[PDB]
């Protein structure tokens, strides 16, 4: 019965390599919120309004997801580094050279790559559920690959996964969202229609496969280069993770401490879909982190 | 320009739990040849005629593949152990209580499980490309899961993979066969039409998913129980493998020596599809192995 994103102004930004859908609200220090797969900026609908009471809030559809599209309709770059440049250009266009980044799922992957590549631009970074892909790949075993089968399917060469997931897009979308939510009734029916309409667009499905392809390839190469160079995130980092068992060496707080000198975080008793499943818990942690690092935002 | 399976007699066997398509030819000691995924008994067309000059040759479609079907059209068992019982019943019906087994791909998985469960029935065992699933699962890493993505896709719960692979069955079949052959022109056009017609049958596709599901679950459990018990194959074993690099502990000859006291084998410079890609090399090795162990066949 609350409206979706009350008072958010919907924009379409024309950047060097993309046409990006953005929604903005608020004043004060800037926050960029980046959704994940197979979603859009509406995934933040339970979080963004509260944040916009105290901050400048920018919500974006990732390149190729939702209503955002690459201008190169044949061979665009959907690597995290390219999407990180999109974020620089987006925030710059809106008046911000330095900003906090809050990401979930693929959006957190864009976010950390942004922070690594462009440390002057990232005041603080929050990851919901994500650790760097280098660490994920090192952890692959039987159970991982069964649970996260789509990491392998969607990364197969063009156009195998596009043919398979494109056959009955809405069925695959619905199946995937239910599975990611552990069957919990977390999707606002109207947000859902938005996710569905995006997924019915073959270009969106292709951009999602390209994301997964990049994760295998160039994104992992970029992480390795940073590890080799000893390059770490320079800002405060918060990681919010799903309450579940983590193998030795796999705990998200432990992993982030190998990538950044200033790390904190908390477990949340919800599914992978933290923005929609546990918005009040997420907000409590986010608000406290941002307040505690108000000097970093300056 | 040679006919397919000249002089083979096509039978349909009515077993306790299945209706099985069988093709037989020859006299002398019995050999049971078991094809793999996504194929049928026709995969042996370049090998079986030569063997039938000197042996009793039995070719079968695995339960649910090709023209073989489970009688339980709702909830059949497609575990390797169940398909191994099918082989006992098949060979018994034809007059054989003890026989050699030559398997490729999923058929070799049926074969080794038969040998373990029913050592009195298996005179000798030949595996083309396969090691026990327990060993495969222990080797899962990033590259394995990308290369063998279908092991993970096809094992997802009912009916996810059936929906995806069933959308355009012939396209997926053709793609998969090309990939497995490394693009080599190895499929006789008429054998191909047979593989295609089977794959167009939703029941066949479902039985294939069930095979992959069993591989994750009960088949692996069965291997572990044998390992725990110290149970090994009791017959001579030959393994013919694809010439490629194998990680330490992963070489097929080394692995089979942990499962059997009498093991030999050879590399063949071909794709995974050894029966069709390298029939002359396979025959040279098979004939020599069977001749060398003629006493075991008695």
* Residues 205-264 (A) with a CB less than 8 A from some CB of B: 216
Q: Do A167 and B164 touch (CB under 8 A)?
A: yes
- Chain A: closest CA distance from residue B101 (Å): 29
Q: Which residues contact residue A135 at a Cβ distance below 8 angstroms, ignoring those fewer than 6 apart?
A: A250, A255
Please answer whether residues A25 and A9 qualify as being in contact, where contact means their C-beta atoms are separated by less than 8 angstroms. yes
Mutate to test the interface with A, among B139, B143, B152 (most CBs of A within 10 A): B152
Buried b (16+ CB within 10 A) or exposed e, B206-225: bbbbbbbbbbbebbbebbee
How many Cβ pairs closer than 8 A exist between chain A and B? 62
Q: Do B164 and A165 touch (CB under 8 A)?
A: yes
Q: Which CATH superfamily is domain B1-298 in?
A: Alpha/Beta hydrolase fold, catalytic domain (3.40.50.1820)
Q: Do B149 and A152 touch (CB under 8 A)?
A: yes
Q: Does A183 touch chain B (CB under 8 A)?
A: no
CA dihedral A155, A159, A161, A165 (to 10 degrees): 140
- The total of other beta-carbon atoms located within 10 Å of residue A118's CB is 15
3-state secondary structure of A16: coil
Residue in A61, A105, A211, A226 annotated catalytic: A105
Residue in A118, A188, A251, A272 annotated catalytic: A272
CA pair distance B234, B225, nearest whole angstrom: 16
The domain locations on chain B are 1-298
* DSSP 8-state secondary structure symbol assigned to residue B167: S
Q: What is the 3-state secondary structure (H, E, C) of B69-91?
A: EECCCCCCCCCHHHHHHHHHHHH
Picking from A145, A167, A172, the nearest residue to B145 by CB comes out as: A145
Residues of B tagged active-site:
105, 272
* DSSP 8-state secondary structure symbol assigned to residue A30: E
* Residue B237 β-bridge partners: B125, B263
Best CA proximity match to A61, nearest among A6, A110, A26: A110
Q: Do A140 and B145 touch (CB under 8 A)?
A: yes
Instruction: List Cα–Cα distances, A237 to A294, A296, B127, B165, in angstroms.
Output: 13, 11, 52, 42
Q: Does B168 touch chain A (CB under 8 A)?
A: yes
B-chain CB neighbours of A136 within 8 Å are none
Q: Structure resolution in Å?
A: 1.5
Mutate to test the interface with A, among B135, B138, B164 (most CBs of A within 10 A): B164
Mutate to test the interface with B, among A133, A135, A164, A221 (most CBs of B within 10 A): A164
* Residues 140-159 (B) with a CB less than 8 A from some CB of A: 140-142, 144-146, 149, 151-153, 155-156
Secondary element (H or E) of residue B200:
none
Instruction: List Cα–Cα distances, B64 to B18, B31, B35, B70, B200, in angstroms.
Output: 9, 21, 12, 6, 13
CA pair distance A169, A163, nearest whole angstrom: 10
Query: For residue A180, which phi and psi values (nearest 5 degrees)?
Result: -65, -30
CA pair distance B66, B197, nearest whole angstrom: 8
Q: Taking the mean position of all CA atoms in its chain, how far away is CA A199? A: 17
Q: Does B175 touch chain A (CB under 8 A)?
A: yes
Secondary element (H or E) of residue B21:
strand B18-25
Give me A135's structure tokens: 């660490």
- Chain B: closest CA distance from residue A153 (Å): 6
* Residue given tokens 């054989």 in the structure block: B96
Nearest CA in chain B to A173: B160
Q: Do B152 and A149 touch (CB under 8 A)?
A: yes
Buried b (16+ CB within 10 A) or exposed e, B83-92: bbbbbbbbbe
* Residue given tokens 């006493």 in the structure block: B295
Please answer whether residues B27 and B56 qualify as being in contact, where contact means their C-beta atoms are separated by less than 8 angstroms. yes
Please answer whether residues A38 and A172 qualify as being in contact, where contact means their C-beta atoms are separated by less than 8 angstroms. no
H helices present in A128-230, as ranges = 133-138, 142-147, 149-153, 160-165, 169-180, 189-199, 202-216, 218-229
Best CA proximity match to B137, nearest among B68, B237, B46, B221: B221
Please answer whether residues B256 and B164 qualify as being in contact, where contact means their C-beta atoms are separated by less than 8 angstroms. no
DSSP output for B119-159: GGGEEEEEEES---HHHHHHT--HHHHHHTHHHHHTTSSTT
* Residue B263 β-bridge partners: B237
Picking from A144, A152, A175, the nearest residue to B160 by CB comes out as: A175
CA pair distance A150, B149, nearest whole angstrom: 9
Q: Do B140 and A137 touch (CB under 8 A)?
A: no
* DSSP 8-state secondary structure symbol assigned to residue A98: S
Establish whether A272 is a catalytic residue.
yes
CA pair distance B124, A102, nearest whole angstrom: 61
């Amino acid at each position: 019965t609350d409206p979706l994103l009350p008072g958010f102004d919907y924009l379409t930004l024309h950047t060097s390599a993309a046409r990006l859908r953005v929604a903005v609200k608020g004043s004060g220090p800037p926050l960029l919120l980046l959704h994940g797969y197979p979603q859009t900026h509406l995934a933040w609908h339970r979080i963004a309004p509260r944040l916009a009471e105290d901050y400048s809030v920018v919500l974006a559809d990732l390149r190729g997801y939702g209503e955002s599209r690459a201008l190169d309709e044949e061979g665009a770059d959907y690597s995290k580094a390219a999407l990180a440049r999109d974020q620089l250009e987006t925030m710059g266009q809106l008046g911000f050279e330095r900003f906090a980044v809050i990401g979930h799922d693929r959006g957190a992957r864009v976010g950390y790559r942004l922070a690594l590549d462009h440390p002057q631009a990232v005041a603080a970074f929050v990851s919901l559920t994500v650790v760097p892909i280098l660490d994920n790949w090192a952890a692959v075993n039987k159970v991982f690959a069964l649970n996260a089968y789509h990491w392998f399917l969607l990364a197969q060469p063009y156009d195998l996964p596009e043919r398979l997931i494109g056959a009955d897009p809405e069925h695959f979308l619905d199946y995937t969202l239910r599975r990611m939510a552990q069957g919990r009734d977390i999707y606002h029916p109207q947000a859902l229609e938005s996710y569905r309409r995006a997924f019915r667009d073959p270009a969106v499905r292709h951009a999602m496969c390209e994301d997964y392809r990049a994760a295998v390839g160039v994104d992992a190469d970029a992480d390795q280069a940073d590890r080799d160079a000893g390059r770490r995130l320079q800002c405060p980092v918060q990681v919010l993770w799903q309450e579940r068992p983590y193998a030795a060496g796999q705990h998200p707080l432990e992993i982030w401490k190998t990538w950044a000198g200033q790390v904190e975080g908390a477990a949340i008793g919800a599914s992978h879909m933290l923005p929609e499943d546990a918005p009040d818990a997420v907000l409590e942690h986010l608000l406290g982190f941002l307040a505690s690092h108000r000097e970093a935002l300056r």
